[PDB]
Each structure stands twice: as structure tokens, then as C-alpha cells.
Amino acid sequence: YTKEQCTAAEAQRLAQEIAFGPVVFQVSRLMLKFGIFQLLSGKREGYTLQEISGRTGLTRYAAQVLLEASLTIGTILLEEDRYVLAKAGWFLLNDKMARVNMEFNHDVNYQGLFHLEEALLNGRPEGLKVFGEWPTIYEGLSQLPEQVQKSWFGFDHFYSDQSFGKALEIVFSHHPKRLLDIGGNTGKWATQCVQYNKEVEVTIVDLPQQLEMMRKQTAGLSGSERIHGHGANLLDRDVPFPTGFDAVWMSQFLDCFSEEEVISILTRVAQSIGKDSKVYIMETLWDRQRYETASYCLTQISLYFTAMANGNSKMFHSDDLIRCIENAGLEVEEIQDNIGLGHSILQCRLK
Amino acid sequence: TKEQCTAAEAQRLAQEIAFGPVVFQVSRLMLKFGIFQLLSGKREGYTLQEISGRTGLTRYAAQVLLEASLTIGTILLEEDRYVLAKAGWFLLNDKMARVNMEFNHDVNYQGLFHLEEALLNGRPEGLKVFGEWPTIYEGLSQLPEQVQKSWFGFDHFYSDQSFGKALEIVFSHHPKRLLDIGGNTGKWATQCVQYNKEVEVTIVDLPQQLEMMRKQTAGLSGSERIHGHGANLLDRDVPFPTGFDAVWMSQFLDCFSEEEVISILTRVAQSIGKDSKVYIMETLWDRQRYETASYCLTQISLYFTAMANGNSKMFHSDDLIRCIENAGLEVEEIQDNIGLGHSILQCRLK
């Protein structure tokens, strides 16, 4: 939260780091992929270049160039003539957030990021064009390569998934009858509800394609006779929302829409409902994080929406989201937050 | 230099490393869109609104850059107005950072994505993002305008532009003829020919390259005394012209495999007398007085891997020295820290 001066004129080094981000990223990806961080992991004493070479079956050249570049980046150290894992390498190896983000940035983002410039300029996801010509990554998804899909789904899960105690005990503090979950195409949330309260009925809204997976994924889970799908297109027209729901829920949904789109979806939400029903918006807000690293990540992430999938959209700053809510005719009745990996929840109501 | 440096904020680095490409593009545009500039104006800093208007960026387009940069740390927040930070300044005003950034976007960005295959297959798999000459050297004249600008800038900035020390190291032996291998801009030869009034300099490089150097050295002071010698430094078969009491290679040669180096250096060993001195001038990362320099040079080697040969690099000196000794020479003297971190090795047969 700093954002108020952090570096001696060793800020000069940061510039250079920034300037070499592409190389650094790539070299660390491979240090990992080729199994060198792992190799170093299991030998405190470390290994020589000829040794790393031998074990990994990489040219001496190939290994020297990665190892040298990592030595100065600082993911490994040099002792006598052996390279040893440094702490930063250990995290690349072991931190699930880093592995997720890195894999994501390679398979989904790397190439398209070249075209971020025109993406900012034009107001659409110009990077997506290196895969195809869909309006959004959402629509083109079923068509991206294996690996690209793999990494995207990992990203989508790592930042969405969770648990859901805090959240659960809050929403049900109002003993609701029918929760309408807009966009939870996995059913994990509705699963939790169902298995938490024994007569709530949950209706998930989403594109039909997406609800075939929810039924797949949710197949023979412990309360699923009470989980219902309702196909929709979430497009200004009728896309009116079902009605008679005591709860309405939206999680990691809608950081993938414009503000303009977000206010439209909400106003249309603000019609489903009576002055009795609560509206819950759960989101990863970059400005409201426990850990600064979390803030850093979320704001770097925002750019994938810009390059791939734009016409939108970003990890919200709480102020904007709160502004967007109040214009849909709703009011935040409290922003309890900091649940799971730093997911804030906004309990709103009508009026 | 090397011994553990980070708290367990090794964890943040892992993430910084993970987001390199985002960090890079975001910061590249904060330059291009002139947002660092605008910010280096009013010390007070500007507001987000003021910033979209001033730039013509959507505001979304602008928020998104500002927010990423805020956390990167290149700018800095005051109430509701952004200020430029020290790191933004270095990007704004430091020439090295600008050369690299521009080099990496225009020349390397897209191709690095194939670094894996290049490291596996031992050629520059990245180059195919533009064409597929064997090498970046044979495709230079064919890359996009902007790519050419950025490569030449890189090429210029990592060369000796000082010369002072080099001149005295070299002319302290009164060479009558100097053979300059790869000196295709003619810049070094111009210095020699204007330093001493009798020396005659011969540049060795591909015939086209030499057309360029006659262009470049056109109408300069010593040029009647600068000659070209058309060769395929590769052709392990053609011998080097002889009769030269100084042979010179500077920032050339880190463009060759160790193999090729030794090949090149043996052919040299066989052109010279016992009294001939041979100078190799490189930017050697292990000999740098400033850590930042080492850092860059080690990262700069991967442009070679992905984009150029797919098999050369910025040398660790132990390797340059080994190579030298296999070619059958020996290093007598070793001066470094010249200019932005150059070293010159003075060698001779034996």
C-alpha cells in the first residue's frame, strides 16, 4: 500500500529489470520447466554447470546461458563453482500463485501482450487475434489450444475457487429461500449452499453451453437436486433475470465486463428483486488486499482483460465498483472483506 | 555479489519475474504514450482524469496503466494525484534503459516466446518470427524499419564510444598496419587513422558490410588509409591477410560459438609474427564494476540464443580466455572498466 517511495538510486536497477522482463520471464520459465530449480532443490550443496548439463540433458551452452541469467536475476546463488537454489527460485518452484501466473502469462498472455498498445488504443482485445478473431476470449475459449486452455482454467480456478465459510455464514445469516447465482458455471458455490442449508434452492444463470458443464461437474454431488440452471445471454434485452430470489450472487464474475456493462447487468438485477432481498458481489479488489504482493498481482492481471477479452474490464478498485453499484440503484450495506485468498464481499440491497 | 539477498520477499520477486511481460509492456507504453513525461512536469503530480485528457487515452486505458505502474513502483500516489517515482525517471531519462527496452520490444519480444526450442535445437528459433535466414545477421537488411532502428541502437550503445584507453594501449607499440576484424562501421579505424598519421587500417568483413563502411567513413580525415578486405570470416578455409602488427576484434566474437571463436582465433594466430599483438575487446559480465551492468549483459545473451546465432553469448572471461589459449595465443595484459564496462585483452602467440 506504500505507493510513496521505495528505492535508493538502485531504482536504476529496477528500470533495467523492467526493461528485461521478457527475457527474465522466459529464462525463469525454463529454469523451471527443464527441471533445474528442482534439481537444485534436492541438493543443498548444489551442482556444477557440467553437472546440471549432464542431468538435464541440455547443451553446456544452453545450461550456462540460463544459469548465468538466473544468477544475476537472483533465483540461484553461486558457491565456489556450484549453483544453489536461492529463495526466489524456491518460490517459483513452490508457490502455487507464481506457477499459476507464470503458466498463465506464457500460454495465454505472452504473445498477445505484444499487441497491448493497440488494445489500449482501440478498446478491444487485440492480443486475442494471435489465436483467432472472436469478440472475447470467452467466446473463443472452446477453441484455444490444449495448453492454452489448461493454463487459462488454472488461472480461472486459482482466483475464483476457495472454500466458503466466511461467505457462507454471512449469506445464510438472512436464511434465504432461493439464491440466484449469476455466472457460477462450476457449481462449487451452489454446492456449498446446498450442502450448508438443507432447503435453499440455487439457480445458476449462464450460457447453456456453460450449464452443460455445471451439470457434468456437479454430477451426483450431495445436494444437487436443488441446483438449477437457467440459460441466459446477459444481453441488455429481455435477459431480464429470473425473479423471487432472496439472494443474488456474483463471484469473480463481472470483473470481466465494462463499467457500462456492469451497471447494465446490475440495473437488470435491481429489477429481479424486492426491497427484502440482498445482493452479494464477491470480487478480488486490488486495493483491499491483506498482502501487498496480492495487490501487485491483481493490477498486473488486469492487463490480460485488456489484451485478451477486453471491451471491459479489470480487477476493480473498490471505489469504482462501489460507484458502479450505486448507479444500478443499489447500495452497499457493508463491505466485510478479506475472505479466502483476499476476496472482498459487498452486501448490497435495493433502494 | 552472490549470497542470499532477499527476506522471504523472494516471494515478490518470483511474482515480478512471473509478470515480466506485463510489467514490460505496461511500462513501455507509459513511455510511449508520454505519461512519464507529462508526470515529470508538475512535481505536484496529476489526477487520473487530468491524465486521460492530457494524453487522449480512454481513462480506462489510463487507469489500467497507472494502477499497474503504481504497484510496479515507477510512479507513486499522492492523495488522488500520481507522481513520477525514481524508477520512472530512470526509464524516462536513462539511455541504457531506453536502448534495452526498445531492443527487447522491437527485436526480441515476439521471438523470445520460442527460447525453449532455440535452447533445445541450438539455433535462433525466435528469428522465424520475421524470416528464417540461418542468422540475424543475414536477415538484418530485411527486418521492419522499427526493428532495424532498435537493433542498430542496441548495436551502437554496446560498443566502445570512448576509445581513449584503446588508442594508447594499441599505439604504445607503434603498429604500422592494423587489421580490424569485423569493424564494419569504420568507427574504430577512423580513430586510429586520426590518432597516428602513418598507420594503415584494414577492415575485414562481408563485401556488402564494407560498402556500408565506405559510405559511413566517407570524407572523414584518415580514410585514404582505411581499406576493406572482403571475407567470409566463416569460411574456415580462407586465411587472414598477413603482415599486420596489430589485429583487432571488438564486440565481435560474442556473436560466435566457442567453436567458431577458436576457429576464428586460430586463423589469426596463423597470420601474425612473434612480435604482433592481438587485441580482443568485449563486455565481460564477470568483470563488471557495477552489478547492474553484469545483470544486463547476462540477459543480453538470450537475444543471441533466440534471435541471432542461437549459440553465442556475452562471455564469462574464463571462457573467452580458454578459447584464446586453444587458438594458441596467450593473454599478456588485461585492462577493463573502460567506457560503460569494456575490457581489452592484449594477446600474442604462444
Cis check: omega of the bond before A70, within 30 degrees of 0: no
Count of CB atoms within 10 A of residue A196's CB? 15
Closest Cα in chain B to A296: B71
Integer Cα distance of B121 and B127 in angstroms: 13
Nearest Cα to Cα of residue A129 among A121, A142, A116:
A116
**Residues of A with Cβ-Cβ distance to B20 under 8 angstroms:** 20-26, 105
Residue-wise DSSP of A78-109: EETTEEEE-HHHHHHHH-HHHHHHHHHIIIII
Interface contact B6-A87, CB threshold 8 A:
yes
Integer Cα distance of A115 and A128 in angstroms: 9
What's the burial of A276, exposed, middle or buried (CB within 10 Å: 0-12/13-18/19+)? exposed
Interface contact A21-B18, CB threshold 8 A:
no
Closest Cα in chain B to A13: B292
E strand residue ranges, chain A: 76-79, 82-85, 178-182, 201-206, 227-231, 247-251, 278-283, 330-332, 344-350
Count of CB atoms within 10 A of residue A110's CB? 23
List B75's β-bridge partners, or say none.
B84
What's the burial of B145, exposed, middle or buried (CB within 10 Å: 0-12/13-18/19+)? exposed
Integer Cα distance of B212 and B223 in angstroms: 14
**A224: amino acid identity, one letter:** S
Integer Cα distance of A312 and A258 in angstroms: 4
Integer Cα distance of B263 and B271 in angstroms: 13
Residues in chain A: 351
Grid coordinates 527487447 are at which residue? B104
β pairing state of B177-181 and B226-230: unpaired
Cα first-last separation, chain B = 34
Integer Cα distance of A103 and B73 in angstroms: 24
**Residues of B with Cβ-Cβ distance to A121 under 8 angstroms:** 61
Integer Cα distance of A283 and A250 in angstroms: 8
b/e code A328-344 from CB counts within 10 Å (16+ = b) = bbbbbeebebebbbbbb
Integer Cα distance of A37 and B240 in angstroms: 45
Query: Could you give all domains of chain A from N- to C-terminal order, each with its CATH number?
Result: 1-94 (1.10.10.10), 95-161+286-311 (1.20.58.1390), 162-285+312-351 (3.40.50.150)
Integer Cα distance of B297 and B290 in angstroms: 11
Count of CB atoms within 10 A of residue A216's CB? 9
Integer Cα distance of B273 and B270 in angstroms: 8
Closest Cα in chain A to B103: A19
**Gyration radius of chain B's alpha carbons:** 23
**Gyration radius of chain A's alpha carbons:** 23
**A114: amino acid identity, one letter:** F
Query: How were these coordinates obtained?
Result: X-ray
Interface contact A300-B23, CB threshold 8 A:
yes
Give the cell for residue A292. Answer: 501487498
Integer Cα distance of B186 and B212 in angstroms: 9
Interface contact B61-A120, CB threshold 8 A:
yes
Give the cell for residue B220. Answer: 572523414
Q: Under DSSP, is residue A68 helix (H, G, I), strand (E, B) or coil?
A: helix
Integer Cα distance of B52 and A112 in angstroms: 24
Angle subtended at Cα A327 by Cα A238 and Cα B71, rounded to the nearest 5 degrees? 115
